[PDB]
Curated annotation (Swiss-Prot):
Quaternary structure, from the entry: Homooligomer. Homotetramerization is mediated by nervy homology region 2 (NRH2). Can interact with CBFA2T2 and CBFA2T3; heterotetramerization between members of the CBFA2T family is proposed. Interacts with TCF12, SIN3A, HDAC1, HDAC2, HDAC3, NCOR1, NCOR2. Interacts with ATN1 (via its N-terminus); the interaction enhances the transcriptional repression. Interacts (via its N-terminus) with ZBTB16; the interaction increases the transcription repression activity of ZBTB16. AML1-MTG8/ETO fusion protein interacts with CBFB.
UniProt-recorded name of the protein: Protein CBFA2T1
Disease linkage: A chromosomal aberration involving RUNX1T1 is frequently found in acute myeloid leukemia with maturation (AML-M2). Translocation t(8;21)(q22;q22) with RUNX1/AML1 that results in the production of AML1-MTG8/ETO fusion protein.
Ranges for domain TAFH: 2-97
Organism in which the protein naturally occurs: Homo sapiens (Human)
Protein's gene: RUNX1T1
């Protein structure tokens, strides 16, 4: 299931350079929506529409079915995790994708 994860990381690097390519807080704004989405704190339809609100860009429509396909992908692996903890996969992916996101690791 780690494959999707490595591809979604490519994906965040894309949004952020894309908003940044324009100029203002707009890469931060688009990043705020991607965080809202992946943290399970925004609705799918809302994530998409706000993102375009900010970017005023006509955009590739693959993004909705993208994350929609990221459910059937990672869910068997992540749901097994969820099962044990006795929590919904939504909040599990929430707490997991954010700790693998953080930069507190000195290494």
């Amino acid at each position: 299931g780690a494959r999707q994860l490595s591809k979604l990381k490519r994906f965040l690097t894309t949004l952020q350079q894309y908003g940044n390519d324009i100029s203002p807080e707009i890469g931060e704004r688009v990043r705020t929506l991607v965080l809202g989405l992946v943290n399970s704190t925004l609705t799918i339809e809302e994530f998409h529409s706000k993102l375009q609100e900010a970017t005023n860009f006509p955009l590739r429509p693959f993004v909705i079915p993208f994350l929609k396909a990221n459910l059937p992908l990672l869910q068997r692996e992540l749901l097994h995790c969820a099962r044990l903890a006795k929590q919904n996969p939504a909040q599990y992916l929430a707490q997991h994708e954010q700790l693998l996101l953080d930069a507190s690791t000195t290494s």
